């Protein structure tokens, strides 16, 4: 009635909605790698590298908690790319890499994917596809000194810009003109590294900032970094909500006869959806299907004549979920009959239904017609001795009402 | 010296299982029936690396031991050393320089540590990140690779973090090996029922392969198929304008002490120069920077008929009005920007200057 | 350069004619698509993959999902109209006598055999060997099974053999098969005694001709090309519609649960609304091609229904409609998603050249033939029916008079015998 | 239930118009479906990015209606050609074509006008009251075979 | 012929190949219509001279 926007509905079979087998419970599966990663050796570190020679720390084989970072008051800037920070604790990764350096505050906007300016040009080029977070904060309390802290250097000069994560510690004199430098400085010939000289009194833009950049190795590959999230018991041959290593899903988890090569973490379908996973605790190859589904076709007499009903769950077999099972689907409310009447409401594969006396929708194999053996023999013929005139009616459409739509009046009013 | 690469180039492109399917992928691959360079033990010259390299060695008893990669190989800039016990590895990235005819007699910033059959042990690089694959093979012509297709058994696929343009192999002292550069290609790959790769198409090999790749099929029925178009690259690059040598006056105009009332905005014309806008868009003095019809980080590639430096003083509230399609008393009664403005707006708080002592 | 056909010239003159002395009853196959795969797609499970987060965005696009379900339903429902209008023309399920005394004609290749596990004829059971996803896609069953379709072709064939065109007219008046063939010959202007005086040979020709079709299908790969094309097109369309789920449409991932796992609401919804736009465009494309392809299959189904009425339930005067040569009768056979007609045609053969004239001059009267044409063998004159040589004597009975000899161009002097 | 075909042609068109009109209420991911809201609540450059959704959605909605109407018009044209054929053959003539001018043997037909269409009345001869008889192809008399004219 | 745009057009998967499939289907059918109207005669007849 709601699908057809009317209480009054003629006799027929009608679609209403896609039925789905519901998930029973939630299953969350993660590697039992219970030791904590060394973020105190990164943000609270006693010394920091020069930005011309930034230091890369692998973060791996552990649990972690990013909420400790993003809830902190300590950070002046916390950009993220390919991921949203409030979500981080649900994820896992094959590795994380923390890249670490000091810069002046004015340079922080260069620490973004594919950027330009002396830091992004000659010191630290982030990739265009960057998946990770950039964490930056003022450190004038620790990295700035009376008369200037000169422990930090940056590359001011280069022949050509850095490729993504290219890194350059070399100290050749930059040739700034036709004059060749030949291993010494002069006019047109300059040493490639500057130094910041951070003094505690200098302005908030010139002050030193620590920067830490967490690249995420967020491949669909064997995990070694995960958030704090817990892990549950496993299930097979039942419809469930689930999460493996941060890949969420909802489906019939099953065992499988698949045989992954040792490096493969997930299997994928033509539709690029995951259809198999290697369990992170157990190394068993689970299959997945979505839980079973189909159109809810409803069989009704006309709602004037009756409001008793039957329903076809199209194409499914009632084992996957009066009742009867057909090649056309799992059929509910309808009452099976042997005697083949003429087809009223069509169902499929020779089945039809109708509303009859004891009242029910009945389901029956359709009659094709009355059956008639013909009296043929090699010497007998029949000839008509009378006739009837007949007057058949035939109906044909010739036109439909001439409509035109002004596309500018319709679109813009 | 050269020999035929046949179809030996393929590797599993990603860490996903797929089976009973044909998959079309673009990456660096060793193209089919190409010329591998071939070498044998009497030798290990230094070689260019290009975009990436395929290496294979057919050898009797671990005669090959590893490789060195880098650019200069001289401790003036960074290099990668690998030395290996079949698949158990020592890796160091360094200024390092072993003796400059490098062999095994039977300052660093990343470090990691793990015929009936002449072996196919086979390798390739993308970026700095070696993919390693292996199988047995009988042989009867030690000059050439075996024709049969195989993306072989997996051994290693790991990334690192470095820079390279040249490389060289390392040998033991008291064998045959091949080198062939990768090129960017679309390949069509075939996965069997057990998710093993069993065939591939190099879509740039010949018109039949281009047809196969167009249809996503390994077999083509009788007919005529549309697949490609004759078009040619920018074969050279050409530049045509009345040429010039003056550095632009922006370094005088922005450093000028005087400035204008906005009802009387100063159209300072600029023309006939080379220029550098990174001087401006990196200058932290600018409390606001905008660009319309152009991106600030693109500006140094461009050229223009003329430039105009329309310049004035406004209050801190009014800064928002200086953009295309805006409204407000400055935009509407002092200086109206077009709805289609092309260029950049460059602005700074001037309370250190225009707010003259005792007020202005 | 392609050849258009072999060179020929007709040996025309103002006084020469050729007449056939023999014929070759010839059987030909015609194949028509009648229906196509009843696909149906749940648009929400295709677009959104069970995400409620996506469903909440998809409602902002309103009634596209309902009218996409309505369009594919209308296509699927008319397939059960086409198949009924093509096959279900016969009001009563006729069946044969027990014994095959059809005057010498051997129907055992195209009538049923209850020995078969599906009660197809031999040729239908051959044709069915010639012709060869969870993402909210489904394929619905047809309303009639293949076994029910083989009862309709069997009823249409059994009514034809036992009662001719009369069951199409309203009742199955039984008739001997060779007399039915005589009235088929009289409908193509071959005088009916040409049949009876050759009945053994006409049977040998017909029986050989059905045999050559069994062998043609038992060897040729390309014969069912029209039906296999309609089967291939619907597979090619579904495999395109499913591969289109893997496309990024510029969003940060191809997988909607990957987006929901990595991004917070406002950052995720920009990516999902991009995938919704791409997936919805990719579904409206498919429904538009299916609406076009469906109306094309309905043109073929109306053509098949017209051949069922005019070729099988009748005999047709429409040149090259019911196969080449003159039409005698047609037998329908079922095939996957389609119908095959076997059309039986009289093709004339073994010509002879003769002299001819439009009229003959006797007692100053001009004589014209009542049926057929005057011909001479070089020494005598005869009259014969047009479509078969048969030299009657020229008489005051098989000719008629109009006026004097002087009017007609090309008239000839010969006597007319008066019985 | 008699005039099913004609009523189906009226009903499908009225349904497609109602569906095209109702898509003017949809948001298409804009902050409102009513174009004045976007023009009032937002500054020009933000308003125009929001209007570009309503333009994209309303246009795609209209292209879908026009594509259905073109296909539906080709279906009415196929029927108009068939009615024009049945006017020429069944009304203006007598047809030898089995079933084409109704079931039985065709005698004659009359056209009748109808809303958006044409209704034929087909007059046909139907044989009835069949006797059975013994039969033979030919008679033998004086040693000659005689066939019926 | 921009490579930069060509890569962004791969993001749409297969619209820009199923359109060549559709237009080639229309194109080959024009030969079939021309064939079926004229090529009904099996031999190239020519008239006598007179
Ligand atoms: C996880 O812990 C269980 C014991 O509770 C153990 O069987 C399993 O091997 C552990 N996982 C790994 C990776 O060893
Ligand atoms: C409407 O339904 C009633 C039973 O509810 C039935 O008696 C009646 O005949 C129906 N109306 C018509 C118009 O037949
Ligand atoms: C219904 O499903 C069961 C398995 O659950 C299967 O054995 C059976 O064959 C199916 N029913 C029919 C009618 O095939
Ligand atoms: C169908 O008919 C048979 C007898 O012919 C009977 O045994 C059977 O129970 C009937 N089944 C139904 C569902 O009526
Ligand atoms: C016709 O049938 C009779 C038996 O009723 C039989 O004797 C005769 O041989 C048959 N003739 C033919 C030609 O079938
Ligand atoms: C391989 O090298 C030879 C020259 O030694 C050259 O003729 C040939 O074209 C090269 N192969 C290919 C595929 O170009
Ligand atoms: C390789 O072999 C050498 C010599 O025995 C040994 O020093 C080295 O530690 C080995 N390295 C690995 C990774 O096996
Ligand atoms: C060794 O490398 C460091 C950076 O890792 C560099 O600062 C130093 O100058 C190098 N040593 C020498 C002797 O140059
Ligand atoms: C695939 O695996 C099956 C066992 O599941 C095995 O029988 C078959 O030989 C394998 N085929 C290949 C080509 O790997
Ligand atoms: C200008 O072009 C001429 C050749 O056309 C060249 O000689 C000259 O060096 C160029 N000057 C500059 C500033 O590019
Ligand atoms: C009729 O006469 C012409 C004379 O050239 C000859 O070519 C042709 O073969 C003859 N045809 C027959 C059927 O005798
Ligand atoms: C023409 O026919 C008659 C009767 O069959 C015969 O007598 C005459 O010899 C025939 N002439 C020729 C040239 O065959
Ligand atoms: C046929 O042509 C001949 C001359 O070749 C002429 O004598 C004769 O009268 C013509 N007859 C007709 C019917 O044209
Ligand atoms: C035909 O026969 C008559 C009587 O024998 C004769 O007069 C006449 O010349 C003949 N020829 C023609 C062409 O009339
Ligand atoms: C003709 O006779 C047979 C004898 O069995 C009978 O079955 C049949 O009904 C009769 N036909 C008519 C139309 O009377």
UniProtKB/Swiss-Prot annotation, chain B:
Residue ranges of domain BetaCoV S1-NTD in the record: 1-215
Region called Disordered, residue ranges: 231-247
Effect after changing residue 163 to Q: Increased resistance to neutralizing antibodies
Documented effect of changing residue 58 to I: In strain: Iota/B.1.526, Mu/B.1.621, B.1.1.318, Omicron/BA.1
Consequence of changing residue 105 to D: In strain: Kappa/B.1.617.1, Omicron/BA.2, Omicron/BA.2.12.1, Omicron/BA.2.75, Omicron/BA.4, Omicron/BA.5, Omicron/BQ.1.1, Omicron/XBB.1.5, Omicron/EG.5.1
Consequence recorded when altering residue 288 to A: In strain: Omicron/BA.2, Omicron/BA.2.12.1, Omicron/BA.4, Omicron/BA.5, Omicron/BQ.1.1, Omicron/XBB.1.5, Omicron/EG.5.1
Region (Putative superantigen): 192-213
Effect of residue 119 to S: In strain: Gamma/P.1
Outcome of substituting residue 258 to T: In strain: Omicron/BQ.1.1, Omicron/XBB.1.5, Omicron/EG.5.1
Result after altering residue 46 to A: In strain: Omicron/XBB.1.5, Omicron/EG.5.1
Impact upon substituting residue 101 to Y: In strain: Gamma/P.1
Effect of residue 43 to A: In strain: Beta/B.1.351
Outcome of mutating residue 280 to I: In strain: Omicron/XBB.1.5, Omicron/EG.5.1
Impact after mutating residue 357 to P: In strain: Omicron/XBB.1.5, Omicron/EG.5.1
Effect of residue 41 to V: In strain: Eta/B.1.525, Omicron/BA.1
Cystine residue pairs: 94-108, 203-213, 248-273, 291-344
Subunit-structure text: Binds to host ACE2. RBD also interacts with the N-linked glycan on 'Asn-90' of ACE2. Cleavage of S generates a polybasic C-terminal sequence on S1 that binds to host Neuropilin-1 (NRP1) and Neuropilin-2 (NRP2) receptors. Interacts with host integrin alpha-5/beta-1 (ITGA5:ITGB1) and with ACE2 in complex with integrin alpha-5/beta-1 (ITGA5:ITGB1). May interact via cytoplasmic c-terminus with M protein. May interact (via N-terminus) with host bilirubin and biliverdin, thereby preventing antibody binding to the SARS-CoV-2 spike NTD via an allosteric mechanism.
Name of this chain's protein: Spike protein S1
Gene that specifies this protein: S
Complete-protein stretch covered: 27 to 448 of 1273
